[PDB]
Every structure is written in C-alpha cells, then in structure tokens.
Amino acid sequence: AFAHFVLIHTICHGAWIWHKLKPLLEALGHKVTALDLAASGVDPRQIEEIGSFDEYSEPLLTFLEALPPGEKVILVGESCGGLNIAIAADKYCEKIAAAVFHNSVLPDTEHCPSYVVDKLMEVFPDWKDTTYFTYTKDGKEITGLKLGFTLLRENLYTLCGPEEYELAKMLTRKGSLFQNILAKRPFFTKEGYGSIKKIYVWTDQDEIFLPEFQLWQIENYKPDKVYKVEGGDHKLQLTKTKEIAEILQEVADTYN
C-alpha cells in the first residue's frame, strides 16, 4: 500500500534533513510532506519568539488540522522529533495511522514530558563545542543552544559524507529543548498519544543516542515494533536511506 508520510526533523534542523529520503519514498508511490517546524529551516521566526515545545510544534498541528476528515498519515520523527509526535497525537490521534521513531526520544504517559530527555542528559552529558544562551519568553527563562561543529561531525553525522556534513554547518540554526517547560507541562495522555501504534527504528552505531539510552527507552515503554538497522550513524535517513525506505514501506503495508 501507499501512505502519506509526514517527516518531522529534530531541533536546530529543518525539512532539508530529509532531502535524500523524500524522493525515494515518492518513487515508491507514497505522498510525502516534509515540514519546517517553527524557527527551523527556512521558517521566518527566530527561537526567541518561541516559548515552548508546543509552540515549536505549531506547523505540524496546523498541518494536521487541515487534513480532510477520514485522511490518515504516518508520522516519522527523528531524534527530538518524538516529542513533536507526542504533542500532535494527543490532539489529532484520529488522523495518525502510526508513528515511527527514528533514533528518537520515546516519551511515555507515566512520567513527566521531560523524563526521557532528562535521562538522555545523564547518558550523554558532554555536548563538546555546543554553545548555550538564555532568553525570556512569557516570564520563563529558556536555555537555547547552537550545536557545535565538532559535535555535529563526530556524534551526529559520524559516517555522513563531507557534503552532507557541510549542509549541517550551513543550515543548522539556534534551537531549544525547552526542558524546564516540558517538566511543568501536563503528561501525554493514554487516549491520545498512548493509543497510537509506535514503531521504533534504531542503530547501535548511534554516537549520541547511545545503545544504553535507546535500549532503556524500549524497556521503559515497549514499542509496537522494533527495527534495528545494522551500521549507519545517528542520521540514518542519510547513511541508510534505502534501508529506512524499506522499513517505511513495510509500515505502510501493516498500518492504516
């Protein structure tokens, strides 16, 4: 079967991270939407105008609001994109056939929204040449970040070609994890996010979302299916594109 995949990037990135995978899925007959979230990619807003992960997720919510009744999509989020999936599934679960976590955080319904991100900080505490800044928005002090180039090269794009790492240096923008605000956010619900079919795709070769963190997430909240890709790096849609398109085809054939 054919599906409508909605591809969701991670913080500091944009729709451009999907420039290799999107053509491949369309060549198999699928419809593909790759969104820039707020203050990301070529979106005009700056991160200082955004005060929460929910505000950050606005292009995705607006997009899901606009789908005609009875039309369903498969959400595919990479890295922190799993938090944008949780926020959207709580509001539009009728519109989601399934969600695919691609080297992604997997929030639960039992602990606070920042839980899985707090655990990532325990497991991976040194972000090398990443720089931080603070800003205020709606009375809250928010810590923003800009991903360092050595961290980009060594941990996120480990095995990507120099021309793919060059795009990351040219296009990554300031972003935020909004961690202190996720902590105070209401929990994701069991009827919204909790009811969605979840497929967890990962590689043990990931150098930021380390096997210890990823296997801990699978044990904390069991996914409906787990696919482990051999080789690659954190950006599997760049280093294992064809393998990821095979997995998504199989997901299109099971879920609707």
Protein backbone atom coordinates (compact mmCIF):
# COMPACT_ATOMS: atom_id res chain seq x y z
CA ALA A 1 0.00 0.00 0.00
CA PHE A 2 0.74 3.70 -0.36
CA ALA A 3 0.66 6.13 2.54
CA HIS A 4 1.16 9.76 3.38
CA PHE A 5 4.31 10.13 5.42
CA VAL A 6 4.86 13.29 7.39
CA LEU A 7 8.53 13.69 8.16
CA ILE A 8 9.49 15.64 11.28
CA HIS A 9 13.04 16.90 11.86
CA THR A 10 14.92 17.45 15.14
CA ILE A 11 15.78 20.73 16.92
CA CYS A 12 18.21 23.09 15.14
CA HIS A 13 17.42 21.30 11.83
CA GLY A 14 14.77 21.60 9.08
CA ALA A 15 12.94 19.64 6.39
CA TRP A 16 16.26 19.60 4.44
CA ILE A 17 17.49 16.64 6.57
CA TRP A 18 15.02 14.52 4.57
CA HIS A 19 16.32 15.56 1.10
CA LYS A 20 17.58 12.01 0.33
CA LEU A 21 14.69 10.00 1.83
CA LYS A 22 11.75 12.04 0.47
CA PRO A 23 12.50 11.36 -3.31
CA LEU A 24 12.95 7.67 -2.53
CA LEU A 25 9.51 7.32 -0.85
CA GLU A 26 7.79 9.21 -3.66
CA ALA A 27 9.43 6.87 -6.19
CA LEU A 28 7.62 4.03 -4.40
CA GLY A 29 4.30 5.86 -4.87
CA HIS A 30 3.93 7.45 -1.44
CA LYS A 31 2.83 11.00 -0.65
CA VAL A 32 5.46 12.81 1.49
CA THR A 33 5.19 16.08 3.45
CA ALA A 34 8.46 17.34 4.98
CA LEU A 35 7.72 20.30 7.34
CA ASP A 36 9.90 23.00 8.79
CA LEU A 37 8.76 23.44 12.39
CA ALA A 38 8.75 26.93 14.00
CA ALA A 39 12.07 28.85 13.82
CA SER A 40 13.59 25.96 11.80
CA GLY A 41 14.90 25.57 8.27
CA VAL A 42 13.57 28.48 6.20
CA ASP A 43 10.79 29.35 8.67
CA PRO A 44 10.89 33.11 9.33
CA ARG A 45 10.55 33.05 13.14
CA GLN A 46 13.56 33.16 15.45
CA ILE A 47 13.83 30.79 18.51
CA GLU A 48 13.46 33.79 20.92
CA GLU A 49 9.84 34.16 19.79
CA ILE A 50 9.11 30.55 20.81
CA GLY A 51 8.34 29.77 24.42
CA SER A 52 7.52 26.03 24.42
CA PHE A 53 7.85 22.73 22.60
CA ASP A 54 4.11 23.01 21.92
CA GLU A 55 4.60 26.41 20.22
CA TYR A 56 7.56 24.92 18.35
CA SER A 57 5.26 22.15 17.04
CA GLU A 58 2.77 24.67 15.53
CA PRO A 59 3.42 23.93 11.77
CA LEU A 60 2.72 20.24 12.47
CA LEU A 61 -0.51 20.91 14.40
CA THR A 62 -1.72 23.40 11.78
CA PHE A 63 -0.93 20.85 9.09
CA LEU A 64 -2.86 18.07 10.88
CA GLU A 65 -5.82 20.42 11.42
CA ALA A 66 -6.01 20.94 7.68
CA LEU A 67 -6.29 17.26 6.64
CA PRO A 68 -9.81 16.35 5.31
CA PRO A 69 -11.92 14.05 7.61
CA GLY A 70 -11.04 10.36 7.16
CA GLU A 71 -7.50 11.03 5.89
CA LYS A 72 -4.66 9.45 7.91
CA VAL A 73 -0.89 9.95 7.97
CA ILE A 74 2.19 8.10 9.27
CA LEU A 75 4.37 10.43 11.39
CA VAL A 76 8.13 9.82 11.14
CA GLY A 77 10.19 11.85 13.66
CA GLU A 78 13.95 11.75 14.11
CA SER A 79 15.85 12.41 17.40
CA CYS A 80 13.80 15.03 19.46
CA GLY A 81 11.00 14.75 16.83
CA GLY A 82 9.41 12.06 19.02
CA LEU A 83 8.32 14.84 21.38
CA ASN A 84 6.53 16.62 18.45
CA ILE A 85 4.79 13.32 17.70
CA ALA A 86 3.55 13.03 21.34
CA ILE A 87 2.12 16.58 21.31
CA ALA A 88 0.39 16.06 17.96
CA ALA A 89 -1.03 12.57 18.82
CA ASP A 90 -2.71 13.98 21.91
CA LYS A 91 -4.66 16.37 19.75
CA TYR A 92 -5.08 14.51 16.45
CA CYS A 93 -4.83 10.76 17.18
CA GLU A 94 -7.74 10.07 14.76
CA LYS A 95 -5.54 11.40 12.00
CA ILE A 96 -2.49 9.17 12.76
CA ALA A 97 -2.26 5.65 11.29
CA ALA A 98 1.05 5.12 13.15
CA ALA A 99 4.20 6.97 14.32
CA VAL A 100 7.82 5.90 13.52
CA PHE A 101 10.57 6.85 15.96
CA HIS A 102 13.86 7.14 14.01
CA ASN A 103 16.77 7.32 16.53
CA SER A 104 14.28 9.21 18.57
CA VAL A 105 13.10 10.01 22.09
CA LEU A 106 10.09 7.92 23.05
CA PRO A 107 8.02 9.86 25.65
CA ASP A 108 5.61 7.92 27.86
CA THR A 109 2.33 8.53 29.68
CA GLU A 110 3.62 7.66 33.15
CA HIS A 111 6.25 10.25 33.86
CA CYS A 112 6.55 13.93 33.11
CA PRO A 113 7.16 15.09 29.49
CA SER A 114 10.85 15.85 30.17
CA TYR A 115 11.65 12.38 31.64
CA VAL A 116 13.24 10.76 28.60
CA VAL A 117 15.22 13.97 27.85
CA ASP A 118 16.49 14.13 31.46
CA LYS A 119 17.67 10.54 31.01
CA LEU A 120 19.45 11.46 27.75
CA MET A 121 21.34 14.16 29.66
CA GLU A 122 22.54 11.59 32.20
CA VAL A 123 23.78 9.23 29.49
CA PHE A 124 25.29 11.89 27.18
CA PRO A 125 26.35 14.87 29.39
CA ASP A 126 29.14 16.37 27.26
CA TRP A 127 27.97 18.17 24.23
CA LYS A 128 31.52 19.29 23.33
CA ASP A 129 31.59 22.70 21.48
CA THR A 130 27.80 23.32 21.72
CA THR A 131 27.16 26.87 22.98
CA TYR A 132 24.32 27.98 25.17
CA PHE A 133 22.35 31.14 25.63
CA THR A 134 19.31 32.22 27.64
CA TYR A 135 16.28 34.25 26.65
CA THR A 136 12.93 35.14 28.27
CA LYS A 137 9.53 34.46 26.84
CA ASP A 138 6.27 34.67 28.80
CA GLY A 139 8.10 35.19 32.06
CA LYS A 140 10.18 31.95 31.71
CA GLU A 141 13.91 31.82 31.25
CA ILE A 142 14.71 29.38 28.44
CA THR A 143 18.07 27.87 27.56
CA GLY A 144 18.76 27.87 23.86
CA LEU A 145 21.64 26.10 22.14
CA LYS A 146 23.64 26.07 18.99
CA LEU A 147 25.08 22.64 18.08
CA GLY A 148 28.86 22.75 17.84
CA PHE A 149 30.61 21.69 14.65
CA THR A 150 32.82 19.05 16.31
CA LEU A 151 29.73 17.51 17.94
CA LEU A 152 27.96 17.62 14.52
CA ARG A 153 30.89 15.89 12.84
CA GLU A 154 31.76 13.28 15.49
CA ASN A 155 28.49 12.36 17.14
CA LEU A 156 25.58 13.21 14.86
CA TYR A 157 26.90 12.90 11.28
CA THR A 158 29.68 10.39 12.14
CA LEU A 159 29.56 8.46 8.87
CA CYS A 160 27.88 11.05 6.56
CA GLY A 161 29.87 12.32 3.55
CA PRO A 162 31.62 15.78 3.83
CA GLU A 163 28.96 17.31 1.57
CA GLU A 164 26.20 16.12 3.92
CA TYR A 165 28.12 17.42 6.96
CA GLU A 166 28.61 20.72 5.03
CA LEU A 167 24.78 21.20 4.86
CA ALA A 168 24.56 20.78 8.65
CA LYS A 169 27.24 23.52 9.17
CA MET A 170 25.44 25.85 6.73
CA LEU A 171 21.85 25.22 7.76
CA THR A 172 21.64 24.35 11.50
CA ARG A 173 20.11 27.15 13.48
CA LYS A 174 19.67 28.07 17.20
CA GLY A 175 17.08 25.91 18.84
CA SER A 176 15.93 24.82 22.25
CA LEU A 177 14.99 21.66 24.08
CA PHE A 178 12.62 23.72 26.37
CA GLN A 179 13.48 21.23 29.13
CA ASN A 180 12.35 23.29 32.15
CA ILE A 181 8.96 23.91 30.46
CA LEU A 182 8.45 20.26 29.40
CA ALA A 183 8.88 19.36 33.03
CA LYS A 184 5.91 21.52 34.01
CA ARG A 185 3.79 20.51 31.02
CA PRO A 186 0.89 18.06 31.59
CA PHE A 187 1.59 14.44 30.87
CA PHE A 188 0.86 12.95 27.49
CA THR A 189 -2.46 11.09 27.62
CA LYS A 190 -3.28 7.42 27.33
CA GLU A 191 -6.17 8.02 24.96
CA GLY A 192 -4.30 10.31 22.60
CA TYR A 193 -0.58 9.58 22.37
CA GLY A 194 -0.96 6.38 24.43
CA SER A 195 -3.35 4.83 21.85
CA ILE A 196 -1.05 5.33 18.79
CA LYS A 197 0.82 2.42 17.18
CA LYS A 198 4.56 3.09 17.71
CA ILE A 199 7.41 1.67 15.59
CA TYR A 200 10.93 2.16 17.00
CA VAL A 201 13.77 2.21 14.43
CA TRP A 202 17.39 2.46 15.69
CA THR A 203 21.05 1.62 15.29
CA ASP A 204 23.55 0.53 17.97
CA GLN A 205 26.13 2.58 15.99
CA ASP A 206 24.48 5.84 17.10
CA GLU A 207 27.05 8.07 18.81
CA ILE A 208 24.73 10.48 20.82
CA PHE A 209 21.67 8.30 21.39
CA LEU A 210 23.93 5.58 22.76
CA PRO A 211 22.71 1.90 22.93
CA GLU A 212 22.30 2.22 26.74
CA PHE A 213 19.84 5.11 26.30
CA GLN A 214 17.97 3.52 23.37
CA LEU A 215 17.56 0.09 24.99
CA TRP A 216 16.46 1.84 28.19
CA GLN A 217 13.65 3.57 26.22
CA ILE A 218 12.43 0.27 24.69
CA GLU A 219 12.29 -1.21 28.22
CA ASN A 220 10.62 1.89 29.75
CA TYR A 221 7.72 1.93 27.29
CA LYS A 222 7.54 -1.05 24.88
CA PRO A 223 7.06 -0.06 21.17
CA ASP A 224 4.60 -1.99 18.94
CA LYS A 225 7.54 -2.97 16.69
CA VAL A 226 11.30 -2.52 16.88
CA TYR A 227 13.54 -2.47 13.81
CA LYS A 228 17.29 -2.41 14.22
CA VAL A 229 19.32 -1.19 11.28
CA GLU A 230 22.88 -2.52 11.07
CA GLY A 231 25.63 0.04 10.59
CA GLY A 232 24.93 3.70 9.82
CA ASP A 233 25.11 6.57 12.33
CA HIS A 234 22.53 8.88 14.11
CA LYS A 235 21.36 10.26 10.76
CA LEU A 236 20.01 7.02 9.28
CA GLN A 237 17.95 8.85 6.67
CA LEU A 238 21.32 9.99 5.22
CA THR A 239 23.59 6.90 5.74
CA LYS A 240 21.00 4.09 5.45
CA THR A 241 18.33 5.82 3.33
CA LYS A 242 17.32 2.74 1.29
CA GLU A 243 17.03 0.61 4.43
CA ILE A 244 14.82 3.24 6.09
CA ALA A 245 12.62 3.42 2.95
CA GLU A 246 12.25 -0.43 3.12
CA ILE A 247 11.15 -0.21 6.76
CA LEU A 248 8.63 2.57 5.96
CA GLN A 249 7.13 0.54 3.11
CA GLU A 250 6.61 -2.37 5.44
CA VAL A 251 5.00 0.06 7.98
CA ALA A 252 2.74 1.42 5.16
CA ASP A 253 1.70 -2.18 4.39
CA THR A 254 0.74 -3.02 8.02
CA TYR A 255 -0.81 0.18 9.43
CA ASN A 256 -3.71 2.42 8.30
